[PDB]
Amino acid sequence: LEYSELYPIQNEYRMMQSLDGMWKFQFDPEEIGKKSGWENGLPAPVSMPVPSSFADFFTDHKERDYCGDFWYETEFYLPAEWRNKKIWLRFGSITHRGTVYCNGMEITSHEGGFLPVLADISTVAKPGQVNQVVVKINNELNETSLPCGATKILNNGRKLAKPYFDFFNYSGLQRSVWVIALPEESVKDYSVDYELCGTDALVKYEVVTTGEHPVIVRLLDAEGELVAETEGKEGILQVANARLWEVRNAYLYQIVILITDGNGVLDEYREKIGIRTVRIEGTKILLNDRPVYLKGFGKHEDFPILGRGFHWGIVKRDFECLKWTNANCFRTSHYPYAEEWYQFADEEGFLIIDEVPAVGMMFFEALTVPELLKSHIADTEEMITRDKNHPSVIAWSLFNEPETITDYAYEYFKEVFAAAETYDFQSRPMTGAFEKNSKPELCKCYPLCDFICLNRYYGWYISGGPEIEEAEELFRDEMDRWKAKELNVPFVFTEFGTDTMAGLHKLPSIMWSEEYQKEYLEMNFRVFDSYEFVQGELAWNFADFQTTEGIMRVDGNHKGVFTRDRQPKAAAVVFKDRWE
Amino acid sequence: LEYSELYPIQNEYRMMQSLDGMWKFQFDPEEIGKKSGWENGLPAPVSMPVPSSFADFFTDHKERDYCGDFWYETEFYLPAEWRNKKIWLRFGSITHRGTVYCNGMEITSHEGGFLPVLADISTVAKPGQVNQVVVKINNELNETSLPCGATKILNNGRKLAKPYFDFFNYSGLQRSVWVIALPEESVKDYSVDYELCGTDALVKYEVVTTGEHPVIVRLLDAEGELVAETEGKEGILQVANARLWEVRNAYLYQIVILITDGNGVLDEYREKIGIRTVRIEGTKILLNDRPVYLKGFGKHEDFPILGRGFHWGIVKRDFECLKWTNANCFRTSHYPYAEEWYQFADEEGFLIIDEVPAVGMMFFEALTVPELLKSHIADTEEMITRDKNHPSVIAWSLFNEPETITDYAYEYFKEVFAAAETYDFQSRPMTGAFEKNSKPELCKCYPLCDFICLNRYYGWYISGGPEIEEAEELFRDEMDRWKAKELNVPFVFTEFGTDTMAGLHKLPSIMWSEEYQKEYLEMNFRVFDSYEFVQGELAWNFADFQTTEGIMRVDGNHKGVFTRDRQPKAAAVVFKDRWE
Numbered sequence A, B: 001l002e003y004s005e006l007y008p009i010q011n012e013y014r015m016m017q018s019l020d021g022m023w024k025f026q027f028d029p030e031e032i033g034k035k036s037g038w039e040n041g042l043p044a045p046v047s048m049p050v051p052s053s054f055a056d057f058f059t060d061h062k063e064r065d066y067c068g069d070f071w072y073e074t075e076f077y078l079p080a081e082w083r084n085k086k087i088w089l090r091f092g093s094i095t096h097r098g099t100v101y102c103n104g105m106e107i108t109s110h111e112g113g114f115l116p117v118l119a120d121i122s123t124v125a126k127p128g129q130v131n132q133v134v135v136k137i138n139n140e141l142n143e144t145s146l147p148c149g150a151t152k153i154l155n156n157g158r159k160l161a162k163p164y165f166d167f168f169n170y171s172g173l174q175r176s177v178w179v180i181a182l183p184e185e186s187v188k189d190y191s192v193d194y195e196l197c198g199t200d201a202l203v204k205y206e207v208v209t210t211g212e213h214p215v216i217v218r219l220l221d222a223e224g225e226l227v228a229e230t231e232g233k234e235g236i237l238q239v240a241n242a243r244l245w246e247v248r249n250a251y252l253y254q255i256v257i258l259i260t261d262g263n264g265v266l267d268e269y270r271e272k273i274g275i276r277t278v279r280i281e282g283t284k285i286l287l288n289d290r291p292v293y294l295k296g297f298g299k300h301e302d303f304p305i306l307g308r309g310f311h312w313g314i315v316k317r318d319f320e321c322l323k324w325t326n327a328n329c330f331r332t333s334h335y336p337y338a339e340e341w342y343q344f345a346d347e348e349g350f351l352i353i354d355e356v357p358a359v360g361m362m363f364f365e366a367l368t369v370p371e372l373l374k375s376h377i378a379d380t381e382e383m384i385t386r387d388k389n390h391p392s393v394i395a396w397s398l399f400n401e402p403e404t405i406t407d408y409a410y411e412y413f414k415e416v417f418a419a420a421e422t423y424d425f426q427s428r429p430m431t432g433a434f435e436k437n438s439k440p441e442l443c444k445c446y447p448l449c450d451f452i453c454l455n456r457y458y459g460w461y462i463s464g465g466p467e468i469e470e471a472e473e474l475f476r477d478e479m480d481r482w483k484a485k486e487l488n489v490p491f492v493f494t495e496f497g498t499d500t501m502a503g504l505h506k507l508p509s510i511m512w513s514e515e516y517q518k519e520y521l522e523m524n525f526r527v528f529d530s531y532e533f534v535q536g537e538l539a540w541n542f543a544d545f546q547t548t549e550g551i552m553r554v555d556g557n558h559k560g561v562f563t564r565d566r567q568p569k570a571a572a573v574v575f576k577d578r579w580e
C-alpha cells in the first residue's frame, strides 16, 4: 500500500485533529460538480453530520434514496507547528467511492466504502492557516466493485440503487475523519505473530518504516512495565510468564515501536495487542491450544437515524447485550466495521470473523470479472493490513453467498485466497459463507477454506411453518451428506434465523411470531448438536436492521434477536440459556 | 463568572482538542473514591462513551438506576506548543454536579448539570506529555439545586433518584469535552444588542477581556466581507443596508473581536450573530417590528440508548422534522440544551425560548429556599451569559410549573427575574410556564412575565375521553377569565398534548389512540383561535421521551407527535397542515 493503515495516535512525533462535526453537503444529480469548481467549495450546501449515513435525516424520498454523485466540505485550522511534516487526511471510510480534494487540489481517489482512505496533503497543506477539504463521493452499485449491484435510471435521469445484497445502501462519510501529521521517517506498518512456549510466549514481529534508521521494539504489560525489548525491524520478543489473551477474558500488552537516530527518537508508534494463537486441528477450532465453540451473531453497522454512522454508544450497548447473551463471537457481516469495534472486542475478549464486502456475486463468466477480482483482492489487502494485529480477529471471511459450483468460480476464489495468504502475517483461518445453492455434491470452493461456514434457513425459506418437521428432515439430510464427505474440517453456521415482529404472538406459533423464532431455533440446535464437526453457531442477526424496501421486508430485516433499538425479543433468552 | 462561556474555536491564538471517545468509568456506591485516591486513576474501570448518558447501556437494573457518586477518567497528550497558554478543560456539562481533577489535583467543582464547566489547568498541565483527567460526578436530586427532587435510601443503602419532574434522571458526561488553550490575555465575554434604523442597523456591543490592551471589533457579512469596524471595549457598529435575521430565513454576520498590542493581535474571537429585534407590544410578539405567531414544540435532549447524549445527527433529524411540520419555534424544556442546538437554530432561522432547569418546585416556605434561590440565580446567570448572543434566543423561561399563589413564591421569583434582567444586555422578553394550579384568581407571579406561557391539558388530565366536550367548555371558562382580566400581554401555550401509542387505533377514538391525539389537538386549536391574545402554540412534546418508571408511564412519556426514533404519528400531519 502507498499509505499506512495504522490507527492514528498523538504523541511527541505524531499529531492528530478530529474533523468530525457538521460538514457542508450537496447533492449532485447532474454530475456537474467537478465541471463547476465544487472542489473549491460547494455552491449551495446544507449541513451534514460526520460521522453518519446521510439518508435517514431527510424527510423526502428523493433525498433518502439519492443515488449518484454527492459532495462533502469542511474547513479546519492547521497549527503552524505541523509545518513540513507528512500531513495526511484520514477517513475511516468513504462510501462507496470518492475523490479527496484539499485546498482545491486533487489528492487521491479510492474505491471501496468500508476501509480507511488516506490522502497525502503534505505538499498542499497550509500550516498556520485555514484549510479546506472537499470530497466527491459516489454511491452507485455495479459489478466491478464490492458490494455488487446495479443502478436503475428512472424518470428524469434519477438514479436508484438496486443492491444484489440484503442491506440498505447507506453511504456518505460514515466514520470518523482526522487530519494527522507524521514524522518524515515513520512507522508505516507492523505485524505480530505468536507462539506459546509453556508458561512463556514469543511475539514474532516485522516493522515497515519509510526510512533506514534503526528500530527498537518494546513490549509493556497492562501496567506499563517493560517485559521485553529487541532491536531491528524484524525480531522476537520473549515474554516470561505471559498473560494470554483469552476468550471473554482479555489481557492486552502494549507494543512500542521506536525509530532512532543516534541519540534521539524520530518516531514512536504504540498499540495494544493480545498474545493468543488460533489454530484449526481436525474439526476443532483451538484458541491458545484449547477448543472453542463459537457462539454469537452476524451483526451490521446499523442504528436508527445514524444508519451505519459510527458511535461509541452503539458499541457499548451492543457489547453489553452480547455479554448478556453469553456470546463469544461475531462476524462483521458484510463488510469491515469501524476500527473502533475491533479495539473494543480486543478489550472485551470477543472473537471476530472479519468479512470483506464480497456479497451479491450470484456471474463469474462476465467480462467484468477480472476488474471485480482486482477490487476484491484490493479490499482483502486493505482489510487484512488494517486488522491483522487485533487479537480479537481470528478468521477472515472472503465472501458471503457467491456462486461456487462452476470452474469459473473456483479459479476466481483461488486468486483471492492466494492473495489473502500473502497479506496475513499470522496466516489465520480463512473461510467464506456458503448459501444453500452451494450443494455438497456441486460446490467446488469449500476445499479452499480452513473451516466451512454455512448460511441455512431450514424452517424459514425452506419448508417453513407447518412444514418445519420436513425442514428438520431436509436439514439432517444435507448435514448427513456433509458428514459422509469426511472432510475433517470444522463447520460453523454463520446464518440461521426467522423474521420476527416484536409483539407478534401466536399460539400455535406462526412464521413471523416471537414464538416461532423460539421453536425454529430449538429445532436448529437439535440438528447442530447431532454432528460432531459443528464448531460454532452465529445467528442471523444480532439486531433488526435496514434493507431496501420491498414486499418481503417490513421496515427492513426482522431476523434480529434484538430490536433495532437494541431490546431483546423472546428468543434472546433462548440463546442466553443455551450459551451459558 | 470566573471563566468564559464562549464556545471554543481554533485559530492562531486559540487551540482545541477533543476529549470525546471512550473514557474509563467506575460506580462508587460506598463513596470511597476520594479516600482511595481515585483522582489518580480508577482501580477497576469499565469503558463509557463520552458524550452520552450512562444509564441505558447496561443490562442490569442497578446499573441503569444508579444514584450517587460515580467517576470518569481519560488521558490526553498535550502538544508542547501549548506551554505558556492558559489551558482549560471545557465540559459541555457535568450532570448533575462534580469535581474535576487533573494530574491528581483538584481543579474546580460545579453544581448544575446542563451548562458548561470550565476548569483552569494551566498550573498543573504538562505540555509535551500525557495528562490525566478524572471527574467525580454525583447525580442525586435535592431541594437546593435544579432540577429538584429527592433521594430515597433503600434499606440496604442503595440510593434511588426520586424526581419532582417528569423526565428520566439521565446523568454523566452528556456533552462534548475539550481541552483548550487560550492566549494569556483573551476575550472572555461579549454582548450584542440591536437597533433597526430604516434600512440600516446598529450593533451595540460590550467586550470583557482578561487584560487592558485595546480591542477592535469588526463585523463581516455572510461572504466574509467587512461591513463595520470600531475600536473600544464598548461601541456601536453601524451596518448599512443590513440583512436582517428573519424567522425561518436566517442571515448571519460574523463578529470578529481582536485584542491588540503595539506588535499586533493578541487574541481573536469569531462568532456568527444575527441582526434582529424582539419586542412585546400589547398582545403581540414582534420580530423586527412585525408580529410573529410561535408554532412548534417543547423538546427534550432524549434519544434511544444515548439518553441526553449530544449527537449532531439528532440535531439534523429533529430540524428536518421541525421544518416538515412548518414549525418556527421550540422551547428548551426543561434545561439549557447543548450549545450546538442553538448554533443550528441560528442557521435555520428557528426561534428559541431558552429555559433554566427550574422544574419540580411544588414548597417556598422551607429553610432550604435561600440556597435554592442562589442555585436558581446561578444557573440563570450561566444560561444567559452562554446563550445571549444567539439570534435564535428570543426569550428566557425562568421556571416550569412551580407554586405561584403564595407571597413566598412572589418574593422568590421577583429576585430571579431581577437577576435575569441584569445578565441580559438585550433585555429580551422573560417568562415561565404555569401549571393549571396557578389559577388566574390566585397566581401572584404572572405579572412578572413579559408574556404568559400556559401548560394546559384540557382533554387529557382534565375531562379526557368521553368528557372532552366538557373539557372544551372548561378550557373556554378559564380563557374567558383570562380575557376578562384584559392583561394586554401575549399568551403562548407551551404545553398541550395526549399520550399516544403509535399503532393504537380506535373508532370512535379513545385516550391513548392516534385518532384521539388528532381530535384533542383540533379541539385545542378551536379554543386557541377564539382568543386574540393567544400568540403561540408549542405542543408537548416533539417526540416520545424517557421518564422514570411508573403506572402512568408506558416506557416513558408518549405525548410525542413523533416517536422516539423520530417518525410521525397521525397527529404530526395535523400540525403540518395548520402551520403551513
Ligand SMILES: CCC[C@@H]1NC[C@@H](O)[C@H](O)[C@H]1C(=O)O
Binding pocket: A165, A166, A167, A334, A401, A435, A455, A457, A461, A495, A540, A557, A559
Ligand atoms: C438465504 C440467504 C439469507 C440471507 N443471507 C445474507 C444476509 O445478508 C441476508 O440478510 C439473509 C436474509 O435473507 O435474511
Ligand SMILES: CCC[C@@H]1NC[C@@H](O)[C@H](O)[C@H]1C(=O)O
Binding pocket: B165, B166, B167, B334, B401, B435, B455, B457, B461, B495, B540, B557, B559
Ligand atoms: C400537567 C403538567 C403536565 C406535565 N408538565 C411538565 C412536563 O415536563 C410533563 O412531561 C407534562 C406531562 O405530564 O406530560
